[PDB]
Symmetry: D3
Subunit: 262 residues, 6 copies
């Protein structure tokens, strides 16, 4: 049977719940996970990249801040087609990776956080501020944020709140240079998230001024899961990362094995 052409970009929000885990998680990612992944999807993924996150900003924990990276894939076909479950060689994936990313608590003496894997079209659906901005305009502090409204909130009500109450605050702030948004493709993998936005600042201070201070003017919604914006449960209904314009980890082009420092 045919395979459908389904160009998509996906984002995974990779946390690191303790600095003591960073070396181990980073090693698995760069030494094990890259070669396993490329081995599987080289023929139908056109780009595979990691964007390490900037240091977590003040109150970043309230936004489900991914303390390791964003992982980005560009797919030509849906990875969740059941026919794609079969692979010659399966990923080497230690259970400890779930500990390091916070999906399960360590057995030593934290509630677990879900694996958030959001599929999107390759092109942003909404361009809400900063159209025409070029790389010549300067370095961006790019705050990539995904949200999913809690169970029993009408999705249209959530959409309307996002674009009529939240985005306008972003748009008004001179500190914010770009707002982009796309609806999550929920039909692919059942992701609980509903929207991905990217919101650019000059720097962390700008991010804080708008995303913490300006957002205080918002009414607390009846569905709120925390007292302040985003009013959503960290790492379950909101995840995020702030990243640079460029990454050296463009894996299909740049990987040459796990060469170690001398």
């Amino acid at each position: 049977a045919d395979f459908k052409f389904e160009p998509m970009r996906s984002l995974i929000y990779v946390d690191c719940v303790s600095e003591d885990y960073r070396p181990k998680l980073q090693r698995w990612i760069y030494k094990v996970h890259i070669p396993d992944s490329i081995s599987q999807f080289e023929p139908y993924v056109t780009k595979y990249a990691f964007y390490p996150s900037f240091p977590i900003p003040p109150q970043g924990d309230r936004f489900g801040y991914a303390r390791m990276q964003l992982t980005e894939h560009h797919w030509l076909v849906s990875d969740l087609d059941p026919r794609l479950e079969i692979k010659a060689i399966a990923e080497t994936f230690p259970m400890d990776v779930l500990v390091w990313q916070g999906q399960i608590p360590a057995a030593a003496h934290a509630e677990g956080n879900p694996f958030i894997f959001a599929f999107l079209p390759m092109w942003w659906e909404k361009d809400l501020k900063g159209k025409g901005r070029t790389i010549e305009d300067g370095a961006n502090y790019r705050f990539n944020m995904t949200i999913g409204f809690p169970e029993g909130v009408d999705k249209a009500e959530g959409e309307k709140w996002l674009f009529e109450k939240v985005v306008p605050i972003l748009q008004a702030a001179p500190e914010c240079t770009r707002v982009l948004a796309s609806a999550v493709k929920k039909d692919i993998n059942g992701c609980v998230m509903d929207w991905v936005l990217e919101i650019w600042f000059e720097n962390q201070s700008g991010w804080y001024k708008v995303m913490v201070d300006d957002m205080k003017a918002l009414e607390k919604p009846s569905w709120a899961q925390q007292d302040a914006f985003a009013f959503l449960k960290p790492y379950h209904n909101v995840c995020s990362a702030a990243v640079a314009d460029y990454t050296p980890s463009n894996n299909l082009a740049n990987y040459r094995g796990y060469i170690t420092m001398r």
Copy 2:
């Protein structure tokens, strides 16, 4: 909504209207344009390449000869789908570039010719089976579009029944390939792209200038001799080699400068 699988090869005819503009145009192309472009389309363009024009031959001006390069993309989706208009980072594009390329004049402008095609030539009209072992080719790539009010079928018939037979008869001409331009993509004015190979510039001249003198001048003619079309507006062209070092998705490593 879905995106349609739409594999295409596109050609842009990049001119440089004065030699004094050459260093500047070339810098923008290789230092600024390449990375902006790869940044946008890496996930859905499988090949992005520049083929620098050979030196403009005698009377090449009459063929809308592109004095910088051919720019070639291979697309998996239509770049003109309205959804593709939104981009995080827009290309750095000074108005000067349009001057250097001649889109805005010294004197009327020359249009930006961006012709979409299928990935595979639709007509193999001469030299089927030529291999790279048969020798270096002087590859003359030419696009033409019939003027306002000329019936496209009459234009087509002229091309394939009058023009091509002359190329077929010349032993200087080793290859003739053609495709109809995909007009549905971007409203390109051009109607056909052809590639016509010779051994060298003299061969090109013998066939495209002298042998073509035998053609009768069409009633729609916009200049006195073949291609009888308005240079840079209804005909563009470049002669290029078989190989380019500028296969950009594979070969680019940043703008490293000479020591």
Copy 3:
């Protein structure tokens, strides 16, 4: 007209019928064939690789063992679409290549050029699901079979999956069994199935594919007395290869650099 999105993996079973041809065939492949091929299909083939064969095992000749390599392509469109026949530069492909590969005999008869198209993902996972590269090196025995003319395809299929595979499953020396139906509609390949069957090494391969298969009964359509009961190089081709190849050509080729 439209071009259909048709993602596929293809395998070509490349023999070298005499050791004296190896340097010539190998030169053509790596010096001439690679750049011609990349030139043609770079924009719509996402992977192009060669997997050199391990040394032919005992009785490998009975399995149509390809003594040069497997050639693997991953396609986005069908290469057999007639619109794809046209190309600016044709491949430099002297008939000597078909002599070296055994398509044209020395002067028994020629062996067919076996070019099998498949889905990109294996259709059946029959043993060893979950195996990772960490579980160790594999002797990967890739085999394609085509039932003889006049054998009902469903009958052949039933034989393969009801009789042959259970023997593979029974053998601890066999760590993986994968299979896909050949896409016959693309290019008319005579083969019906491609399987890949992993062992630890040649001795394991032999114990199962030769000794354990003696328990099979000889089918009425047999073209040889022992499994695979099919005509070597005509109705069965194979190769044993490693997990990794350096010849991942769209990523790794830098021209024909010669040893000093």
Copy 4:
């Protein structure tokens, strides 16, 4: 005259004194500095890499912790040979870079520390035979330079008879390597570079902070606790991973921007 074969490894400790500067400094490093650097030294530098620092650990400020990266070069000739001062194209360098790194304060500064070493560690004092299969390392690279008028041999003795044994005794520390700085190349004030491995940040702290409390404070001390040297001036450091994707001569493909 001849050029001397002088294979060396150098390290630069690159700080970022405020998070608000990170995006600008990183952009300059990766968009501008890389191609300028490669342009100049490609023919005589065999490796050029950046190792981004792990998040500054607690009390890391007292160790002159570089909050951006280590920059590492492998040289075939001395970059301080006066004949190498001449360059067709000079590096693009906004003054602001010195602010971002803390060399000059925002309108006292910290010096630019650029230490040359042999390509191979001179002393292997703990963990000989450790391979990459034994696990991920928290690699703490530290350079120290004894203050004005402290006898170098007395400093050395202190380092190797008092400091290193604490490292050798700590199970949390898996590796100790050291080389003397080549002071004759560029006047670097540093005297030693050590690299000291741990499993993680907490191990680092246990050893470099807690265990070192047993040391007697030297009479030359510039701060109360180990390393007893002035942060950023007489001691700099960074903790880095075993691997970097920024192996610049092999891996750089231009400043491709996120979509």
Copy 5:
């Protein structure tokens, strides 16, 4: 015996004497010569690049303008050490290449491999046919010896029309006399011209391969007009030397005693990093 560490940069001035030869010469260069060269010297050459020439400017012929490219190598050892004459695989080097480049006149049977008692490529690169133009292969230190104008210029200051020129004073002319003329008469004209943004120069290492050239300069302009204004118009002011081989600057015999090329800041042909075989257009 030891091999001496001898880091050097070399330049070859590659002409193409007729446009009809261009496709053939360019094919040999990119299809045949690249892989042969990399195969031989990958272990001791750290950079190997081609910088295609800008279109020959007006009066460029009087400057020995290389109408194909500059070929540039960076060496760690001298390619002229006699021990380096031995090579497992020799360059495929038809005589046609010397025809296309102007080293020898057109003749029958020049598709033949070049002849030599030693190596064909090493002999091809010492070509000095009385009837053609010699093969100019100049060794230099890796770093310019003199920085005469434009110190501190960055790539941010703009695109350069880089005119690279080599000169060799005729037989009989005192080298010190020539040097003084160059640096006290010629260079000051370049220095005085606002159109000229950079002047760099090095002495040719003559001890390596007996190259006839004595100096390599690189002189930058904004463009072809600026080059012309300075190298043709401003240079009319110079008095003609008694040793002159032509009436106007550089007063040297084109292609024999002066060669040159104008090139861009960047080339895509950085061959050790960027070559992926001779992929042909579709």
Copy 6:
């Protein structure tokens, strides 16, 4: 102290003593050894490559034929300088590798690691041959005269008795040779030669049949040429002109077949 500039090419003759070891040895070579090696010497080795051996020819065992590969390094400094013994990260090298290569039984064969100058010292046949002249079957062979045998006398035998047989044979298209640098690492080998043929049959006709004309020297360790103890005093491999495993330029990690 200074490091000396010492450009060299080295060869290692890598055997595989049983086909059942091949998948494991090859995995180790390509998955573990490559990155460990590059991690150590990237800054001072300009080339690192493997040339997989052609299938062992008849009587190849008498030439210490390497059934896995030749490993080639080009060094800028001597790897045997004791200062280079120190490495931050050591290589992962289990004793199994020595079993697979035949250095130890499960006395075995020595590890043969020969340093040469980067350029062949002697060009004895086929000077001028280009790659356009055709594919070569390149027989690379290193020999070391037994204990007690005078080196000059061995040398004379090689260049005056053996080589002229190669020169006379039209099947042999190239003869190159260099003296092994014995000062670097104590290698017992004295010469490396490379001898080209069109193919295996040509190799055999010359190296087996034509060499029967040679008198058995008094120091002979086997009855026929090369008269040296296989794997101990003669090793070899036959290889192609090209290898895809040019490791510093071509390696992208251990990507596995799907």
